[PDB]
Amino acid sequence: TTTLAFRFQGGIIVAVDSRATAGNWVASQTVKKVIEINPFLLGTMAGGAVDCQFWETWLGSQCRLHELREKERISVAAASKILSNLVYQYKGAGLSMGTMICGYTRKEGPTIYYVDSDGTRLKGDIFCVGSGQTFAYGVLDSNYKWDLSVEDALYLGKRSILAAAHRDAYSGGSVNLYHVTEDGWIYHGNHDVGELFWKVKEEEGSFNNVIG
Amino acid sequence: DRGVSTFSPEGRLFQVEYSLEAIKLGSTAIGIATKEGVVLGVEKRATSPLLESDSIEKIVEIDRHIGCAMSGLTADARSMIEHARTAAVTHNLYYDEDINVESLTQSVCDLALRFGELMSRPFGVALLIAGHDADDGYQLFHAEPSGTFYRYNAKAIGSGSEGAQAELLNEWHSSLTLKEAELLVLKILKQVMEEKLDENNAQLSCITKQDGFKIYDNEKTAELIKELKEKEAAE
Amino acid sequence: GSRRYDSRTTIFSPEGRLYQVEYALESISHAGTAIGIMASDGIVLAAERKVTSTLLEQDTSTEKLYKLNDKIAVAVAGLTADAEILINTARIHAQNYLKTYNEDIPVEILVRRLSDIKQGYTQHGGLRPFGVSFIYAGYDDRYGYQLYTSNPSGNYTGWKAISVGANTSAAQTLLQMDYKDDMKVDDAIELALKTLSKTTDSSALTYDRLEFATIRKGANDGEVYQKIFKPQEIKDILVKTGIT
Amino acid sequence: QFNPYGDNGGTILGIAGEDFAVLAGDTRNITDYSINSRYEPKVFDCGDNIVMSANGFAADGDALVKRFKNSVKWYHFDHNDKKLSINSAARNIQHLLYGKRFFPYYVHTIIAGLDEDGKGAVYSFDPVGSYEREQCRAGGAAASLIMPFLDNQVNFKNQYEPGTNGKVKKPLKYLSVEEVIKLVRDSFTSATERHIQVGDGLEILIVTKDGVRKEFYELKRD
Amino acid sequence: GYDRALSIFSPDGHIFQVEYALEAVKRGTCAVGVKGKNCVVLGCERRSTLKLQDTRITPSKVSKIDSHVVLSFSGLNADSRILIEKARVEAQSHRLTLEDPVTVEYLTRYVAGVQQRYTQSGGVRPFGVSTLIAGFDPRDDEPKLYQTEPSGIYSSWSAQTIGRNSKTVREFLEKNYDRKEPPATVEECVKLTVRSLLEVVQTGAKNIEITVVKPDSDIVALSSEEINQYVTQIEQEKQE
Amino acid sequence: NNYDGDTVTFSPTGRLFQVEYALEAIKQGSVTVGLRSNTHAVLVALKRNADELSSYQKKIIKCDEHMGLSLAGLAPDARVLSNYLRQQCNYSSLVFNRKLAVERAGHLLCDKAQKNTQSYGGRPYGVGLLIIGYDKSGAHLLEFQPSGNVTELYGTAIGARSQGAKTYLERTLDTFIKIDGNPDELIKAGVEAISQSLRDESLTVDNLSIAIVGKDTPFTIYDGEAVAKYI
Amino acid sequence: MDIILGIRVQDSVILASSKAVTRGISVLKDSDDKTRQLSPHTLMSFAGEAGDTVQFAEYIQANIQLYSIREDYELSPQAVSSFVRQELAKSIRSRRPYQVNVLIGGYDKKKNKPELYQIDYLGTKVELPYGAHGYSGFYTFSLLDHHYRPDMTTEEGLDLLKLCVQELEKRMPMDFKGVIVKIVDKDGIRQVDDF
Amino acid sequence: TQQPIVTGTSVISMKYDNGVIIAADNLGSYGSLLRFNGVERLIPVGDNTVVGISGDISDMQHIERLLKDLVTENAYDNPLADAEEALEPSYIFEYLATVMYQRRSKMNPLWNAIIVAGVQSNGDQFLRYVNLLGVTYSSPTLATGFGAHMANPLLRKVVDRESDIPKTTVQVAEEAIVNAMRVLYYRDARSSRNFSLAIIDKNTGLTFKKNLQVENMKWDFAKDIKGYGTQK
Numbered sequence A: 001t002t003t004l005a006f007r008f009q010g011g012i013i014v015a016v017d018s019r020a021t022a023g024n025w026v027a028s029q030t031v032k033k034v035i036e037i038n039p040f041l042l043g044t045m046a047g048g049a050v051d052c053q054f055w056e057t058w059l060g061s062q063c064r065l066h067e068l069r070e071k072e073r074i075s076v077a078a079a080s081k082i083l084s085n086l087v088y089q090y091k092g093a094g095l096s097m098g099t100m101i102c103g104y105t106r107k108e109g110p111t112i113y114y115v116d117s118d119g120t121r122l123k124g125d126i127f128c129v130g131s132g133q134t135f136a137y138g139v140l141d142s143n144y145k146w147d148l149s150v151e152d153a154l155y156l157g158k159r160s161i162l163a164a165a166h167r168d169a170y171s172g173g174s175v176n177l178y179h180v181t182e183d184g185w186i187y188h189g190n191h192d193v194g195e196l197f198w199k200v201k202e203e204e205g206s207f208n209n210v211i212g
Numbered sequence B: 001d002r003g004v005s006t007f008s009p010e011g012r013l014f015q016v017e018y019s020l021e022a023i024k025l026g027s028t029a030i031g032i033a034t035k036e037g038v039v040l041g042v043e044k045r046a047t048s049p050l051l052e053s054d055s056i057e058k059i060v061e062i063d064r065h066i067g068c069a070m071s072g073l074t075a076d077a078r079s080m081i082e083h084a085r086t087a088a089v090t091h092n093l094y095y096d097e098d099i100n101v102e103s104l105t106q107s108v109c110d111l112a113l114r115f116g117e118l119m120s121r122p123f124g125v126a127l128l129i130a131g132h133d134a135d136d137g138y139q140l141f142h143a144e145p146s147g148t149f150y151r152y153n154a155k156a157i158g159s160g161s162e163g164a165q166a167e168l169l170n171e172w173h174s175s176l177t178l179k180e181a182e183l184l185v186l187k188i189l190k191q192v193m194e195e196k197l198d199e200n201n202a203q204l205s206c207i208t209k210q211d212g213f214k215i216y217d218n219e220k221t222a223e224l225i226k227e228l229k230e231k232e233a234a235e
Numbered sequence C: 001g002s003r004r005y006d007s008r009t010t011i012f013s014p015e016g017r018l019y020q021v022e023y024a025l026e027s028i029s030h031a032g033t034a035i036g037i038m039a040s041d042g043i044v045l046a047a048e049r050k051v052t053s054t055l056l057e058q059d060t061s062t063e064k065l066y067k068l069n070d071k072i073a074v075a076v077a078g079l080t081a082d083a084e085i086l087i088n089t090a091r092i093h094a095q096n097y098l099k100t101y102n103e104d105i106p107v108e109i110l111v112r113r114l115s116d117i118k119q120g121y122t123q124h125g126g127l128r129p130f131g132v133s134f135i136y137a138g139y140d141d142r143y144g145y146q147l148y149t150s151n152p153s154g155n156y157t158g159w160k161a162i163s164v165g166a167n168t169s170a171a172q173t174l175l176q177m178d179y180k181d182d183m184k185v186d187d188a189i190e191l192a193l194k195t196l197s198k199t200t201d202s203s204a205l206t207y208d209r210l211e212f213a214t215i216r217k218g219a220n221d222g223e224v225y226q227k228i229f230k231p232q233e234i235k236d237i238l239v240k241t242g243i244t
Numbered sequence D: 001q002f003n004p005y006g007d008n009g010g011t012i013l014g015i016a017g018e019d020f021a022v023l024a025g026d027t028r029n030i031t032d033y034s035i036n037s038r039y040e041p042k043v044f045d046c047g048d049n050i051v052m053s054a055n056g057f058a059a060d061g062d063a064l065v066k067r068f069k070n071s072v073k074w075y076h077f078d079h080n081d082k083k084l085s086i087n088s089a090a091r092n093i094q095h096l097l098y099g100k101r102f103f104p105y106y107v108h109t110i111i112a113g114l115d116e117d118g119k120g121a122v123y124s125f126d127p128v129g130s131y132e133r134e135q136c137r138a139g140g141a142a143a144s145l146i147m148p149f150l151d152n153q154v155n156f157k158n159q160y161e162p163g164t165n166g167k168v169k170k171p172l173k174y175l176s177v178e179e180v181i182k183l184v185r186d187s188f189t190s191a192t193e194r195h196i197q198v199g200d201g202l203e204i205l206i207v208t209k210d211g212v213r214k215e216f217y218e219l220k221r222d
Numbered sequence E: 001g002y003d004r005a006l007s008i009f010s011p012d013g014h015i016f017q018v019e020y021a022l023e024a025v026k027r028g029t030c031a032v033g034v035k036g037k038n039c040v041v042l043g044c045e046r047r048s049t050l051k052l053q054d055t056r057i058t059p060s061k062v063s064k065i066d067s068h069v070v071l072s073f074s075g076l077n078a079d080s081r082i083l084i085e086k087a088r089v090e091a092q093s094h095r096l097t098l099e100d101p102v103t104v105e106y107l108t109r110y111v112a113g114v115q116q117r118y119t120q121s122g123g124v125r126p127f128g129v130s131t132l133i134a135g136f137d138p139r140d141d142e143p144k145l146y147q148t149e150p151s152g153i154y155s156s157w158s159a160q161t162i163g164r165n166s167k168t169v170r171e172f173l174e175k176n177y178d179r180k181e182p183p184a185t186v187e188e189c190v191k192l193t194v195r196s197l198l199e200v201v202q203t204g205a206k207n208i209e210i211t212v213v214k215p216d217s218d219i220v221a222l223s224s225e226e227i228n229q230y231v232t233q234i235e236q237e238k239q240e
Numbered sequence F: 001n002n003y004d005g006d007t008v009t010f011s012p013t014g015r016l017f018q019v020e021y022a023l024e025a026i027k028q029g030s031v032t033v034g035l036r037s038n039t040h041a042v043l044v045a046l047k048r049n050a051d052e053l054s055s056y057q058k059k060i061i062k063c064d065e066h067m068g069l070s071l072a073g074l075a076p077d078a079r080v081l082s083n084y085l086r087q088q089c090n091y092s093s094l095v096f097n098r099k100l101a102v103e104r105a106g107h108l109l110c111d112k113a114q115k116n117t118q119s120y121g122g123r124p125y126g127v128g129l130l131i132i133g134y135d136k137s138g139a140h141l142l143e144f145q146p147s148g149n150v151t152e153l154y155g156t157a158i159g160a161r162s163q164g165a166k167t168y169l170e171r172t173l174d175t176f177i178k179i180d181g182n183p184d185e186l187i188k189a190g191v192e193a194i195s196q197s198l199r200d201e202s203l204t205v206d207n208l209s210i211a212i213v214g215k216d217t218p219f220t221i222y223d224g225e226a227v228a229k230y231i
Numbered sequence G: 001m002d003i004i005l006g007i008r009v010q011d012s013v014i015l016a017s018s019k020a021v022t023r024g025i026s027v028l029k030d031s032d033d034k035t036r037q038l039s040p041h042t043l044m045s046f047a048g049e050a051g052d053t054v055q056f057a058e059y060i061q062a063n064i065q066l067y068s069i070r071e072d073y074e075l076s077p078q079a080v081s082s083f084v085r086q087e088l089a090k091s092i093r094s095r096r097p098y099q100v101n102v103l104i105g106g107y108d109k110k111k112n113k114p115e116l117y118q119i120d121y122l123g124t125k126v127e128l129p130y131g132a133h134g135y136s137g138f139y140t141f142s143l144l145d146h147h148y149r150p151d152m153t154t155e156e157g158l159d160l161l162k163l164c165v166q167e168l169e170k171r172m173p174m175d176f177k178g179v180i181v182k183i184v185d186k187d188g189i190r191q192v193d194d195f
Numbered sequence H: 001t002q003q004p005i006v007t008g009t010s011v012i013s014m015k016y017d018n019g020v021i022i023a024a025d026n027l028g029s030y031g032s033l034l035r036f037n038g039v040e041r042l043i044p045v046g047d048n049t050v051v052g053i054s055g056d057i058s059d060m061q062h063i064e065r066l067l068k069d070l071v072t073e074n075a076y077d078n079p080l081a082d083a084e085e086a087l088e089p090s091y092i093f094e095y096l097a098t099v100m101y102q103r104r105s106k107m108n109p110l111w112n113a114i115i116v117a118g119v120q121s122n123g124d125q126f127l128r129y130v131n132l133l134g135v136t137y138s139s140p141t142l143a144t145g146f147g148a149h150m151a152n153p154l155l156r157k158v159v160d161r162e163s164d165i166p167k168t169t170v171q172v173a174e175e176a177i178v179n180a181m182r183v184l185y186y187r188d189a190r191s192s193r194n195f196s197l198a199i200i201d202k203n204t205g206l207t208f209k210k211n212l213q214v215e216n217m218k219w220d221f222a223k224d225i226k227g228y229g230t231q232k
């Protein structure tokens, strides 16, 4: 995995790859690493597949129960802390999870929480998580500004995952894009790297390391 | 004294039969099932005019496709609802689907008899559980503290129930619309209620497949009260 | 089964009273009177022993006054055996607080916990309540000198002067009459003894039918001293106030 | 020291058509360099038009299949004989597998059937419960030999339209039951040649709206 | 464990132990809550058959649950401490997991649920306590006043009273409290609270406690003179 | 009188009144009938409604592919006992790869109900059951009473006015016992039997409930339009 | 984590805590506050094993806040430090111990005195004029032995702190992304914004 | 976690037209020491099932007690205990398979490999294997230990697939089994000459043969072998 999510002028961008690995064996190229917890809350998945899948679907059930009991949508802070407190109970048992809880609420605004299986929980504007995080950081950090347009931010997120998909042997498949605003999350499609790489190479004039 | 799980000589559990009396002292709750939806309505019955009536929560969401109204010792319902919500969400977690209205009701009715010498007494509250699912469509269930549940086309519980049920017997037919059913609940509530029915001391709700379970606002119900009186003056 | 023989100690009367607590208070009303009086510079504890026999060992005896820690003491009214169970609990609770915080326990905190234990016996478990009322006399650096009382209900209140046990109605009237806020310890001593002298069911108050204690700042500079009076010392203070 | 796991070999294969789905598996059971059985079936009809196979460590595989079959039975009792949809079965199996996250079933699991719109479906699991719906999946020993062949022949990967300068991809299309069974048989004969744990017999279960049919074929026994 | 079902149904459908717990509340000292336009006030009677009290150290009738919520009560004093302690623990637990202080409705719902659990659990009797819970939700200036009771039912109140002679002061509040125009200022709200207590109390001396809660964790307890001023002002306006 | 306070008390004549009061709940229950040939076993149950707006309480429960019962009395107690049976039938399959003999099913129900009649705090079950099944020794019908007593029979009935149907079966015995290889005729004899227990009301489409099990017939329940054939 | 310092001067206690949060070869955050206010006049900084640090700090925080509400009274820095030590002393013999070192800086309102307590994960407590956890101490203790005086002002304490941070940035192998400084005195807790 | 102490070697078995045959030697080894020589490792259950057990003998004896107890329990309140409701081989097997897998799942295995041979009530032949891991499989020929490596190949020359079973008589089948037992005695260092053999036939029932011996052994060619290469 490579996953990222960053905050900017126009909300939150969330971009993830779609590869599953079993060592050097490519297990899948078409895997969903984003979970839509609710219309205003997203969760990203990196690490052990089922650990992430099982416990973030469980997180969704806990968030659903909160709004039934409190007649109100759970805060991003509270949703992230349910997940972090859960994994902390299992600390040492060998869970492997690198997650980002992204979403909007009126009281918080757009918010991103990094939560991992060591029990670390951090609020922040930018995170990249997974085996290809460094590759994504390299592109994102050198092109990131707060004042990016929704169009440019969407592309930068897409291009950052592409960068990692290329260099990281354990990332690839396709880019899944999301945009989160005051009105909730908006899906911006699946982008197969098989076609996207050549489209980007040609149009951008980049990736000159490759035989074109 | 005498055991909590004792049978009477007539073959009934004393404690269950006594909890049934407690339910008859409860505020009126009515439910009507149609092909366009199920309507749930209740008498709020504030004990004093200083009590803020919108804080009286007697109609309650269980899931998006299941709703619930109560009558009797309403404090006893809190844990029953908590169970229902957990059962409903848990089923969705295990099976990636909505849970059947009957199965939900059955899960709640299992709690009912878990009393004796588990909890110390039966519940002192009856529930109307209304919802929709793909298999059996729109449904209304009456869940007693005996652990028994009946499906109903229409049903009233609480103090005004015997009179309201007789009225529902005549008025219900298989081609009722949702609008007609809303009015019918309001009509029968105003009949059996002590104080005069208004948008503050009565509350409506429905569950439709499209929009799920909704509690009506006091503004929305007010217009249905006005629409009801206008239609009764017109003959 | 066993249901037949259950008294149901933790239930309400139709009037909303706790039978067993009410009856425990009735038991306490026949116990030797205990008095607490709080002054600006100390606290007095005085208590009347239950009809003594001349062959009782008076000097090596402890029926009424108990030391909880260095800064806190209690006067007992009711079943001694019940009180000793609670006292050892209180003594342990104080040592836990000191061990946890490296600070002597605030008087109220100790009082609240003992009273919380009593409360539990009225609400759950189906056991009889403790037939005991305490007067707590103590000092800490927050509120200074403090008097509290607790009873079988688990309810506790603070006092300037208070009595428990027998003839508290008579004793409280007398205390209310002669007590004043600027009062000193030595005056409070005199008040305590004069009050017992008038409320007693005995013919006359003597040294061998009394237990007596003071908590003053009477040590050397900014520190507290508990004085549990010896028999000869009570005999002296009884002469000095003209009761004998 | 006691090793509670073992490798019983074999390999399995799931392909989904438009209005059908196949779940195939060889019938050989092995330990180390020995053959235990030339015909030991490991693809089962579990009811409600769901077929299941749990390849790897047979004792864990049989345990899982047995539990899921039981899960279907109680689903009927508890929910008024309702049909267990393929998506619901998958999620149920995730919880079975993850229930033993810290002492796993050593199995790669595949189920096949029809989704709620009547279309063919294949779901596949890792040993601890992560799952995914696909048109195509091989599992077990020879998965590494068969899977890339399926990527090429079922999803037409790396295949472009002739004379389009490698610009237009070969379009995806559903396969007939006749074509799918050809790919299954060729996949298994290829796997048998080059993997020692695969051989003896091939057993295919085909799932349509009309029910579950079986087909059997001999494989090389060396 | 002691298992006995103490709270049980009678043939008429009543739970006598719950109802007798209400009788204990009726015996308790009066308590009243009035909420203004921008404040809530909690008034509490203190029975004056107890002179020689030490008022510094005697448990106050209004207890802070958190910096933004208070709880007063009528009924058994010992029972109230158990509900208060639990409520305080839940308040800190809510801050820890949700990263937000409790709403007044949530905190009320918790205390009500505890009270209810003691009406259908073996070996225990119900709490002989009804509570008034007041305060302001985090980042909200709309005031909240709730009441709970031994059965476990809870509800919101514009203004409300509990304890002995509460039916007298509820009568007073019912004509003297306008929903359309609630006490605009703090002064107005405290005045109405004291007036309603003066219908019942005896003498407005050390018999009345007042606690004023404002938004953003602004809670203060009034003292003798500050209360006595309201008393003197109300009596002078009376003689007319 | 003085000896009906709980299950753990004998009367001076040697009776257990709480068990007898539990038996009384069955008499108030709606009638249900059981009967068998050598090839099939049948349950016929009259279902009861609360009023005309309500559903008709379901009386028949499936326990396994080869076994199930009908209830008369407290329905939740039948749910507990049927669930226990479902588990026991299932334990037999998973562990021994063996369908549970109907006779053993009876023995297990007896022993479960009995424990509640000797312990303090508990209560007897307030329901009667009729178990039908087809196993390795052919078709079977059992009658369970909550005292613990279980009885194997050719046919029987329990509930209100069950005496009528029970006499008919006692007369008809030699006829219905030989209805082999004919499901529809054995059901008819059951429907005719239950009709001897009717008063004022008669059998309608949503009022009647029939179940059957046999040689090449899994335990299946018939309700609604699928029982119209037999009225 | 890694760098947490503390200096007690005449009238205040100054705590300095590094802002970096690192995992693997990525600095995930450069603005992390490694501290929790236990009460208005008591502040605890923390450093150690990931997850444990915050979980422990917030658990201690809740407990002290619960005490404050119950008694309507603020616990002394000495009492809080003793409570915290006991919790760590329990922890070390648990199934899985809290691997967290802390510094507790507080102003005692009864004594009108600042107090600095250094406590490691084993439950080893000491009151010090200046303290540090981790490798920091290997540079700062000797520096402060030389430059520190007991009668220094809060401003002189901050200059002394800059001298520590300068030395650490010069000689420490890791980039800890500077520090957040907080002062604890009679008027409560406040943060220095420009450091 | 165990380690096996006193052990039994191969158990071999096969199907034939009317029934099944199973055999196992009578040795209880203690490492390389051939400690005990009167050990019966074929245990009949009723008159329609034989359970052959290899591996740890203490655990075998435990399994004997379970099966013996199973018969008793099945008879309780069962008028048809010797008829329709008698223990089937499939019932006995599944019970053992259940136990084996539960024990491995609690990291405390019964250190055995088991073959349940019998005939079902409907006449069908039953032959299925289970071991310490709870692994189960069925085949026309089954064998444990060295048996799997040396017996199976020989037995499979007789019955190579399902369709060869009706063609195989009991005379042919028993001959193959007795020959296999000889080969194992030549080549297994923890085997003995003495063994027991059991036939479960659908017509003639259970025949249990004890005290059999390996005979007709070729050893004469040994006298010609000298040295290891160059010796004359």
Ligand SMILES: *[C@@](C)(CO)[C@](*)(O)[C@H](Cc1ccccc1)NC(=O)[C@H](Cc1ccc(OC)cc1)NC(=O)[C@H](C)NC(=O)CN1CCOCC1
Pocket: A001, A002, A019, A020, A021, A022, A023, A027, A031, A032, A033, A045, A046, A047, A048, A049, A050, A052, A053, A094, A095, A096, A130, A131, A170, A171, D126, D127, D128, D130
């Ligand atoms: C990239 C591809 C690096 O692996 C991502 O982290 C990716 C995230 C992901 C998220 C959701 C769904 C699929 C994939 N992770 C993987 O693909 C993951 C890599 C991984 C394996 C094992 C780990 O052990 C702690 C940690 C990471 N691959 C898997 O989970 C694969 C599909 N399953 C297994 O390896 C089965 N294992 C899981 C651990 O228990 C033993 C069996």
Ligand SMILES: [Mg+2]
Pocket: D221, D222
């Ligand atoms: Mg080979």
